[PDB]
Amino acid sequence: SMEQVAMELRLTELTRLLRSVLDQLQDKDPARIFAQPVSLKEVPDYLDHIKHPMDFATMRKRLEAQGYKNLHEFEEDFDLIIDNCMKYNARDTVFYRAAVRLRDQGGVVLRQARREVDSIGLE
Ligand SMILES: Cc1cc(NC(=O)C2CC2)on1
Ligand code: NA
């Protein structure tokens, strides 16, 4: 149907916006601490601590499959990256501190992203 095509166009446009958002958020992780899944070779007990691992590569996979239907779903995964890190790692670590900085700098990007999604009507 034409209606189905219209919704699919909206999803494609949301995906384009979120790709730009994801690139901007990842730029706020210059150490690439969140670029890939936490290594279970490096951290064998990780899944005993963290029930829903997340990282930028995993987000990008979902994104290019158009697996984010709205901004909320995308933000949920971004928040997992930060929240998982701040639980597993202590306050005085480069890991925890990278998450705090990503959260703070990322908030700015996401604030304007919400306006664009609403204004254009992408969800
Ligand atoms: C625990 C834990 C580890 C990480 N990140 C990394 O180790 C990437 C390679 C630098 O995030 N949380
Ligand atoms: Na902790």
Swiss-Prot record:
It comes from the Eukaryota. Highly expressed in testis. Residues 9-113 form the Bromo domain. It is found in: Nucleus; Chromosome. There is a cross-link at K41 (Glycyl lysine isopeptide (Lys-Gly) (interchain with G-Cter in SUMO2)). Transmembrane segments: none annotated. Scaffold subunit of various histone acetyltransferase (HAT) complexes, such as the MOZ/MORF and HBO1 complexes, that acts as a regulator of hematopoiesis. Plays a key role in HBO1 complex by directing KAT7/HBO1 specificity towards histone H3 'Lys-14' acetylation (H3K14ac), thereby promoting erythroid differentiation. Component of some HBO1 complex composed of KAT7/HBO1, MEAF6, ING4 and BRD1/BRPF2. Component of the MOZ/MORF complex composed at least of ING5, KAT6A, KAT6B, MEAF6 and one of BRPF1, BRD1/BRPF2 and BRPF3. Interacts (via PHD-type zinc finger domain) with unmodified histone H3. Interacts (via PWWP domain) with dimethylated and trimethylated 'Lys-79' on histone H3. This is Bromodomain-containing protein 1. The chain holds residues 555 to 676 of 1058 of the full protein.
